[PDB]
């Protein structure tokens, strides 16, 4: 076997911020050079930039470099763009006469740091027509916040909920450097139709922020 | 030159996977391929390589249940792995890595989903835009695709003349064993009495498309 150990793990950079990732391979990479970078972009299938420790691909941005040598390796990025969100790999071959195998990195994450951003919250009842399926979705939308992390907390006639919730967060917008969540609560119709006051509640630094309706106005 | 993964699909729980990778513009035995795979919300994972003189090396987390072989005749690698955990449901890639040759290629990849459930169209609900979901002269709506399988759904705004402020969610796995996700989108609050919303559903697995018109209130 062969692995790669990445460093860091996830990160965040000003745009124009200079970016340093580094990889350690469990064992020496073929002829000394067999490291590849990979790139992720969200929604894509993974993307080759760098090969043999330092050559860049033909069509990769010219911000992007590798170096390195035996078992430590480094990804540049020189001047970090929003499009670099991504998650990067370092790809490591280990070759022998008997021996041959690969290993990707942990990853590492990468996004651009801005100025924090309130969520603007909504929230939406289940439609009548859900409810005559016997089960009612109660949507909290946390629309263009950063930085990513937030608290969705459920009330339902003041009670916390706990158990019956999803969520789910878009990518990092390529325009503005926001994310968005979604909070989902599940409910049966009969559990649903015995209360009436729904909240979801968020939370980002010093500032919670409820929306809330009440059933059937 | 095109690698294209084939055999691709649902498998229970226990069963195996039988996944073809085949060459087009070259032989298949003129390089050595691999087999990656990425679970959800997971990293890139190397599962085994064949060498172009045909002798197969597994990583060792994959060795015990996996086999990879080459058909000549056919121009393809082959990839068969047993006892097919939750944890193998993954888009499925064979690819030459290229970590030290220029000559790097990868095909489209395959999702292999590995559950007891069946495949199921969605059932979309409207997230209908109110008094409460308008705050100033933005209003949000959307539509809760809920109850699919397997993945994926895409999903698009009035035939995709709408996409600025539109955020699609990653689906989430319900208890159920089918997924579900949201699609918002925020829009002027004086467009609501006149415009129309309808967010296009396309459900590939089971031929399914939903055209589901959002209306306010």
């Known amino acids: 076997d062969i692995q790669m150990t990445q460093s860091p793990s996830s990160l965040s950079a000003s745009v124009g911020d200079r970016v340093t990732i580094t990889c350690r391979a469990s064992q020496s990479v073929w002829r000394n050079k067999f490291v590849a970078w990979y790139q992720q972009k969200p929604g894509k299938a993974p993307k080759r930039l760098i090969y043999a420790i330092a050559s860049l691909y033909s069509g990769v941005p010219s911000r992007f470099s590798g170096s390195g040598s035996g078992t430590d390796f480094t990804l540049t990025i020189s001047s970090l763009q929003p499009e670099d969100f991504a998650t990067y790999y370092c790809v490591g071959h280990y070759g022998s006469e008997n021996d041959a195998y690969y290993a990707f990195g942990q990853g590492t994450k990468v996004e651009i740091k801005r100025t924090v951003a309130a969520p603007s919250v909504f929230i939406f009842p289940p439609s009548d027509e859900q409810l005559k399926s016997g089960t009612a979705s109660v949507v909290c939308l946390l629309n263009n916040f950063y930085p990513r992390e937030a608290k969705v907390s459920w009330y339902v006639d003041n009670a916390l909920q706990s158990g019956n919730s999803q969520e789910s967060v878009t990518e990092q917008d390529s325009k503005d450097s926001t994310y968005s969540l979604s909070s989902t609560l599940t409910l049966s119709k009969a559990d649903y139709e015995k209360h009436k006051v729904y909240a979801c509640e968020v939370t980002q630094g010093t500032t919670s922020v409820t929306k809330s309706f009440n059933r059937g106005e | 030159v095109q690698l294209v993964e084939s055999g691709g699909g649902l498998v229970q729980p226990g069963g195996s996977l039988r996944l073809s990778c085949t060459a087009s513009?070259?032989?298949?035995?003129?390089?050595?391929f691999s087999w990656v795979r990425q679970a959800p919300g997971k990293g890139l994972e190397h599962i085994g390589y064949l060498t172009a003189g045909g002798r197969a090396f597994y990583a060792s987390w994959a060795k015990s249940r996996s086999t990879i072989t080459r058909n000549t005749n056919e121009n393809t690698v082959t990839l068969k792995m047993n006892s097919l955990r939750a944890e193998d449901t993954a888009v499925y890639y064979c690819?030459?890595?290229?970590?030290?040759?220029?000559?790097?290629?990868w095909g489209q990849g395959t999702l292999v989903t590995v559950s007891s459930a069946s495949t199921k169209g969605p059932s979309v609900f409207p997230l209908a835009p109110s008094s409460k979901s308008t705050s100033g002269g933005t209003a949000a709506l959307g539509c809760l695709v809920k109850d699919y399988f397997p993945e994926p759904v895409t999903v698009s705004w009035n035939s995709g003349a709408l996409t600025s402020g539109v955020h699609t969610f990653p689906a989430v796995l319900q208890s159920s064993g089918l997924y579900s996700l949201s699609s918002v989108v925020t829009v002027p609050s004086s467009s609501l009495g006149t415009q129309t919303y309808i967010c296009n559903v396309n459900h590939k697995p089971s031929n399914t498309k939903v055209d589901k018109k959002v209306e306010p209130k």
């Open positions: 690819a030459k890595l290229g970590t030290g040759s220029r000559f790097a290629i």
């Open positions: 513009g070259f032989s298949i035995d003129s390089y050595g």
